[PDB]
Amino acid sequence: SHMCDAFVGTWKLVSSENFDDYMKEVGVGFATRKVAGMAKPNMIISVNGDVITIKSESTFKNTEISFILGQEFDEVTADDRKVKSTITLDGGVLVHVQKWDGKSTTIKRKREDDKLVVECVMKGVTSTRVYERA
Numbered sequence: 001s002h003m004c005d006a007f008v009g010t011w012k013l014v015s016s017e018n019f020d021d022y023m024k025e026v027g028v029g030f031a032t033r034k035v036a037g038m039a040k041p042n043m044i045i046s047v048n049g050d051v052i053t054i055k056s057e058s059t060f061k062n063t064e065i066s067f068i069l070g071q072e073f074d075e076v077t078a079d080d081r082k083v084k085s086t087i088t089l090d091g092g093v094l095v096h097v098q099k100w101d102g103k104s105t106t107i108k109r110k111r112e113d114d115k116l117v118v119e120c121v122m123k124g125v126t127s128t129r130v131y132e133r134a
């Protein structure tokens with residue numbers, strides 16, 4: 001269906017701003033924050049029919065999620081939270097909401113020029129992570 005054509009590919013992290021503070025707000029502990037904050041992951045996005053797969057590969061952790069838009073799934077996050085996740089496409093932005101322990105955080109993925117921009121928001125704390133094509 002050409003769903004998510006502009007997101008598909010292999011992307012590498014180039015910059016990460018306010019990410020330690022975002023992780024602190026989420027509740028991530030000191031040692032995980034330091035090591036995860038140092039990671040320079042490769043994000044690999046693929047689509048096969050209705051199923052979207054997002055992989056993240058780095059020295060910190062290798063993760064993989066597969067999902068259908070709008071259809072909740074149970075995720076173990078890279079920081080070891082057990083969350084209920086829903087990913088939707090809203091006006092061309094991939095919107096990932098994670099719910100756990102009466103808390104919520106939203107991770108948005110946007111295509112801007114030749115970049116993929118990731119915005120993570122927890123209450124009033126935002127972090128921006130910019131990816132380029134690998």
Ligand SMILES: Cn1c(-c2ccccc2)c([C@H]2CC[C@@H](C(=O)O)CC2)c2ccccc21
Pocket residue numbers: 023026028036037039041043056058060061078079107118120129
């Ligand atoms: C540890 N860590 C990572 C992370 C950090 C490094 C490697 C893997 C996961 C993320 C996300 C992963 C999705 C997205 C991204 O892929 O950049 C934005 C950050 C994240 C979000 C909340 C808390 C801790 C978190």
